[PDB]
């Protein structure tokens, strides 16, 4: 469970616009 909680945090990042824009900019370079 302790490890499963972490993957839930990532789950939100990718549906958080603000976290997204930092994901995409991370790929641009």
């Amino acid at each position, epitope marked *: 469970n302790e490890q499963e909680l972490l993957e839930l945090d990532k789950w*939100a990042s990718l*549906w*958080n*616009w*603000f976290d*997204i*824009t*930092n994901w*995409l*900019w991370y790929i*641009r370079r």
Partner: antibody
Amino acid sequence: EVQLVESGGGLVKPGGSLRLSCSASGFDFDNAWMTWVRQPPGKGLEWVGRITGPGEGWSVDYAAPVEGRFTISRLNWINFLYLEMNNLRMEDSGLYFCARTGKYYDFWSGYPPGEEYFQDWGRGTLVTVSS
Amino acid sequence: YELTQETGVSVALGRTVTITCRGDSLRSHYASWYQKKPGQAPILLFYGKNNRPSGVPDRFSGSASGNRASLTISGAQAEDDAEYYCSSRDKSGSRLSVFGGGTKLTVLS
């Protein structure tokens, strides 16, 4: 076909409080980002605050000269946007709009968190303040 | 305090004119453009690199270069006598938003 009707504005003494309402129809409200913009008398538009959507946890960000007195909230069950104001001052008087906030991010040349544009605008409700 | 604009710009009927927005955040973020006639709701004109909303005439064109944004009207009409506001992020990397002084477009009579 998109309709936004602001109300709940009027006259109040300084230090008072007020609650504005903004209906919504013609688009999916429950997920839309929403923004409050005000136009003082004779001056231009001034961004107040914006409430995000479910992917963002309904988080809100406020303008600097405003943060601390106002609070924005939303009732998606009925498609209503609310702006409570406290410790009102003379500066706060002006026309108040609610605007459907869209989002832009050019992948190749954009910079986080991107930009925000205001698709639709209501006629707005006039606030006035006087001692 | 963040974004600057011209206050009073003019042009004759059928000519061309451009009004510009300026700010250190425009080096990193695009800007939106809105028309505002007194007693009428603002209207979104242009946003991002190239996005004109439907129902807008094609004569409106935007452009970005350095720390400046710019709106352009080709062959200005009488109905374009109005006020124009740019809008972007108050700072590079902020979650907020801001407007400029605004610009009155006088269709010269």
